[model samples]
Target: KIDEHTIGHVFHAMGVVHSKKDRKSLGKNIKVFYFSEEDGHFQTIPSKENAKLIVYFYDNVYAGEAPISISGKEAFIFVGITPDFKKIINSNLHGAKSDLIGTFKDLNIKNSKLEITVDENNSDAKTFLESVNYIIDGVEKISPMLTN
Candidate 1:
């Protein structure tokens, strides 16, 4: 069963915000939750449709849903860029390649939010944990570039 304890362990190991309150405050349009096998699917969460950035885990899959759908067996991380940041990138676009676009292509971007997925079947626990940390760092780096 993928209960709160399991979710807590994963977040703690990943060094990401594990508290319900912290996750809820991620953004104005973001909502995070943990759904277990017993809880059914990630789609069962309340008010999920209203969230632009949805982060959740169920069974072996860590996933996020928006216009983009990402599922990883071991871990998943998402970063939702602010509108101000998007504006900055847009204004700077001329003839140069946008570093943000280049770095975030395969991970999938929906409504300016980034989603990453890693499979447990193909990755060790350590690798899974590390990926989460890396994404967290990426988010941190992107923060200063944001207008807010």
Candidate 2:
């Protein structure tokens, strides 16, 4: 199992900054829910105010719980736009597509969710995280236009 220090280090390498308070207050925007059908793959429970990206470290790696049939080095990253934002994108498809095409090339959208599976030990992990960071930045740039 991955230790908390390893998880924190990975997050740090990804340039994800989080204060102690941010971790404590994750409930406001970051919601983690389990799914039994998919063998309890933890995912973000999407909502209007949910954060654009949710990272799930499978196999209860950091929690030191029973493995969920996944390797400790694997992480499932969820990137998605809210439904309301999606409607806005749909209305301005051309502009939205143009803005997102480059950054989202490797991402696959299923039910409005962009799924990215990363293996921390793999050489491509850095590239994957960079793409994720870029996607977050790209989405933030257009979020104001999509929202009121």
Candidate 3:
């Protein structure tokens, strides 16, 4: 990282983050949901109309766990909003699980956004993120996400 420098810039903003190691990705179309307090519910986002996807492992930064969509870039955040931005938090987690948290955003797509926010209080968030990450990691064993 040459003194924290990366990709020709130390100040990282958005876009493809990293490449896959030995094609570990199986090609699963996975999506992570977040809790929207304003809507008081959970929502599943789609991977179309220029969307960025990120995968994390077990709530850890090192490993976790979308699509092209730009597949296998290891982008942890997306910037633009998705087509289902108003759907609200469809994942569902306790309002007390951890308080609240957000991931980064992607810049290569429309609304260039990443996964939804997770509430520590709720129990559905971790389940949702972890499952999505694993599915994204082992895409070969699973199918891509299908939105209605």
Which candidate leads in TM-score?
2
* Tens digit of per-residue lDDT, candidate 3, span 1-148: 0122212111122122445441123112122332211232222334222323222211111111222111222232212222333211111111222222233232121121224565666444444444434323332121133221
The root-mean-square deviation over C-alpha atoms between each candidate and the true structure, in angstroms, is 15.0, 14.3, 15.9
Candidate 1 yields a Cα-based lDDT of 0.32
lDDT for position 104 in model 2: 34
Off by over 4 Å in 1: 1-122
Spell out the clash pairs found in candidate 1.
73-119, 74-120
Report model 2's TM-score to 2 decimal places: 0.24
Where model 2 places Cα greater than 4 Å from the true spot, the runs are: 1-20, 28-30, 38-73, 85-102, 105-148
* lDDT, candidate 3, at 37: 17
**Model 1: which ten-residue window has the lowest total lDDT?**
87-96
Error in Å for residue 4 of model 3: 52
Q: Which model is ahead, 2 or 3, in terms of lDDT?
A: 2
List model 2 lDDT by residue over 90-137, tens digit each: 101111122332333334434333455555675444444444444344
